[PDB]
């Protein structure tokens, strides 16, 4: 397993060097939220993360409601979403979490399936690769209906604060990632890549 971090604005100083250090080696940071909101940290974080070698991409805080998926998925990818074979960069990461007022954001399974597909091809065509899929396994199941659909396309990142990993949503075989608590030591959440460094740096490439 390979360890990383995730960090936003909550977060407004970080030691990326330490981090690196004490063996992190990737970072997710956030960069947008719904249509209109950027992470005023992204810059420095994403600036500070590469100066100290770790490996790093975007993510968005979606908001099913206020939007289309393609809206949104053009949002992120221009305001830090981006993606090349560096080999340095991840994939920008989809974060589905649970609403202000209700757990799937006041849409159907079928609407709420639909949304993330439109989110997901829209940054397929914009970076060249699927995005990763954060979620929490129950979100997934009541929220999608188990949706497989995106199984054999977008990295699953599963969030699931315990022991073990617990069951794998979806039809996925595996999480790629695991975020599996809130209490990063140097800010942020805690996450695990599911293999090697050789491996992470082969998800960043896109080989």
């Keep these: 397993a390979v360890p990383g971090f995730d960090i936003s604005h909550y977060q407004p100083s970080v030691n990326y060097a330490g981090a ?79 609403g202000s007022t209700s757990s799937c954001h006041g849409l159907s399974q079928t609407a709420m399936v639909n949304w993330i597909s439109d989110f997901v091809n829209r940054y397929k065509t914009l ?29 699953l990142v599963l969030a699931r604060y315990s022991s073990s990993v617990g069951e794998i949503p979806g039809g996925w075989g595996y999480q790629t990632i695991w975020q599996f608590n809130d209490k990063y030591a140097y800010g942020g959440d805690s996450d695990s890549f599911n293999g090697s460094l050789d491996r992470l740096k082969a998800l960043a490439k896109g080989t």
């Design 127 to 155: 970076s060249g690769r699927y995005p990763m899929i954060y979620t929490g396994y129950y979100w997934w199941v009541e929220c999608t209906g188990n949706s497989n659909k995106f199984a054999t396309t977008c990295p």
């Design 20 to 98: 690196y250090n004490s063996g992190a080696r990737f970072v997710i940071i956030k960069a947008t939220e719904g249509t209109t909101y950027t992470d005023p940290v992204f810059s420095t974080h994403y600036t500070g993360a590469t100066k100290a070698g770790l490996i790093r991409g975007g993510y968005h805080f979606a908001r099913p409601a206020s939007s289309s998926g393609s809206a949104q998925a053009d949002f992120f990818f221009k305001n830090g979403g981006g993606w090349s074979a560096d080999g340095i960069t991840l994939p920008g990461m989809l974060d589905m979490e649970y």
